[PDB]
C-alpha cells in the first residue's frame, strides 16, 4: 500500500 | 539484452548472462513469456546464483556494484515469477540460500553507506527481503535504517528508493506468520518508525513520500498486540497533534489516520468522522452548473468552472438527443444532480479522495453511481486537474467519465453491478462515442493495423486483463457502427437495458453479431478509406 | 492484496 517514489498522473479511470 | 541467454540448463551460463547483461536486461524477466521464466528461475539456478551472490556480497567494498544489483534483482524477479506463474515453483532449499545472500550484504561493513551507487544495489536487497518472504528476519536493520535516515541520505534518489523499501517489508509482513508473531513486541522499531514519520525536515522535501508511508505503516501496527503497543499509540498521538488533516504534514496525518481508522478505534485518537470535515476543507469551492451538475473543487479558476460546465452541458444535450431519452430517467433512479468532485492534482487526489469517498486512488479517477434507488444516494464523479488534460477545464478524464453518469441514469437500470450479462462494450463504447463523436484517430488506427475483433468478440469484452484497445477503441467502433447503420436496433436494445431485462438485451445483440459482421467490416473499410 | 514488487523507479 506504501507509495513508490514515482506514481503515474495520466491513468485510465478505475 | 538477450533474454534467451537466461534459459540455459547451466547455472554458470545464467550467472554469466546476469553479469554481462546487467540489471537493465534482467528487467525483461519480470514480463517474459512463461517458457523463459520457467527456464530462468529453475530452483537450481536460484540456489546456485544465490550462492555466488553470497560470496560476492561478503567481498563487497562499498561504492555500488553493477553485478550485485543485477544478481539481487534476478533473485527477487524469481519470486515475482513464482508468485504469478503457476509453472514456476521453488523447492524448499531455495529460500535459505537467498536468505544467506541477503545476510551477506546486510552483515557487510558497507551496508549503511550513503550513495546513489550503493542505493542501486541496496534497493534490490531490501526489496528481496519482502519478495523472498523474509520480512521477519531483518527488523533490527529496518529499525537502523529508520533511525539513521537524515537529510544527507535524502539527497540521493536511490537511497530514497532503498529505504522506502522497508515500508514494503512492513506491509508484506502481514502475510508472514513469524512477522505477525513478533512485530507487536518491537518497541524500538515502533519508536524509530514514529520518529521517522515525525521528521519535520521531510515536509516539502524529496523524502516526504517516505514519511507519509511511515505514518501509514505505523497506524497499521495497531492491528498487532504486544509490548510495543503503548509506543505505537504514543507516536500516533504525536503525529495527530503535530500535523493536521489539511495543511502542514497532512500526507503523514492522513496516512496514519487511514490505517488507524481501519485497524483501531478512532475515538482513542480523536479522529472519528474526520473524513467529512476533510471534505469541506479540501473541496472548498462549490460551483453549480445547473440543476443536473454541481462542481465541488479544491482550486479551480472561474474560467475552468465555466469551461467544465459548458463542455458537460454540450455533452449532456448531445447525449439526450443521441440516446432519444426524452430526458426521462430509468425507474428507481433519483441521482438527479451529478456531483463533480475535482482535486487540484493527482497528488491531491491520492492524498484526500481516499478518505473522503472511501475509494482506492491508484487510478485516474472514478464515477460512483452508488445505489440509485436509496434515498440520500449521491452520484459522485471523483477526479483531478492535470496539466495535459483537455483545455479549457483541464480536468483529467472529464468528458469520458461524465457520460457514465448519463448512461447510468438514462440507459442502464440499477447500480453498476446490476447487469447479469456483459455490458462493458456498451458502457465504455458509449462513453467514448458521446464524448469524442467522430474524432477518434486511435480507433481508425486499430482497424489499420490489421488485427481486429468481430462484433461477437466485442460484446464479450470484460475488464479482465484490461485490454484497453478492445475495451475503449473497439467498444467505440461497435457503438458508432450501430448508431450510424442500425439506430432502430439501438433503440430496441435500450428498451431492455432501461428496465433491467439483461437476458433480452443479450438476445438482442446476439442477433446483431450473427447478422451484421460483414457489414461491420464494410463500415470499417469505409472509415479507413475516408482517413486515406 | 499482497503482490511482489516489480521494478523500482529510475531517476529521470
Ligand atoms: Ca443505472
Ligand atoms: Zn469509462
Numbering used by the authors:
A (entry chain B): 1 to 14
B (entry chain A): 78 to 609
C (entry chain C): 1 to 12
Per the authors:
Protease VhaC is a multi-domain enzyme composed of a CM containing an activator domain and a peptidase domain, a PKD-like domain and a PPC domain. Sequence analysis using Conserved Domain Search showed that VhaC is a multi-domain protein containing an activator domain (Ser70-Tyr346), a peptidase domain (Gly347-Val605), a PKD-like domain (Ser606-Ala698), and a PPC domain (Leu699-Gln814). VhaC had activity toward various types of collagens, showing that it is a collagenase. Structural and biochemical analyses and molecular dynamics studies reveal that triple-helical collagen is initially recognized by the activator domain, followed by subsequent cleavage by the peptidase domain along with the closing movement of CM.
However, only the crystal structure of CM was solved to 1.8 Å resolution. The CM crystal belongs to the P 21 space group with one molecule per asymmetric unit. The CM structure contains residues from Cys78 to His609, suggesting that the N-terminal signal peptide and propeptide in the CM precursor are cleaved off during enzyme maturation. In this study, the crystal structure of the CM was solved, it having a more contracted saddle-shaped architecture and lacking the catalytic helper subdomain, when compared to that of Clostridium collagenase ColG, the only CM structure in the M9 family. Unexpectedly, the structure data show that the CM molecule binds two peptides (peptide P1: 24-EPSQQVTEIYQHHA-37; peptide P2: 48-DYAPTKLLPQQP-59) derived from the propeptide of VhaC via hydrogen bonds and hydrophobic interactions. While peptide P2 entirely binds to the activator domain, the N-terminus of peptide P1 binds to the activator domain and its C-terminus extends and binds to the catalytic center of the peptidase domain. Correspondingly, in the CM structure of VhaC, the C-terminal residues of peptide P1 also bind to the conserved Gly441-Gly442 motif, representing the S1′ peptide recognition site. Therefore, peptides P1 and P2 can be regarded as substrate analogues in the CM structure, which may provide clues for the recognition pattern of collagen substrates in CM. In the CM structure, a catalytic Zn2+ is tetrahedrally coordinated by the side chains of His477, His481, and Glu505 from the peptidase domain, as well as the side chain of a histidine from peptide P1 instead of the characteristic water molecule observed in 2Y5022. In addition, a Ca2+ ion, located on the left rim of the active-site cleft and 14.2 Å away from the catalytic Zn2+ ion, is coordinated by the backbone oxygens of Gly485, Leu489, and Gly491 and the side chain of Glu446.
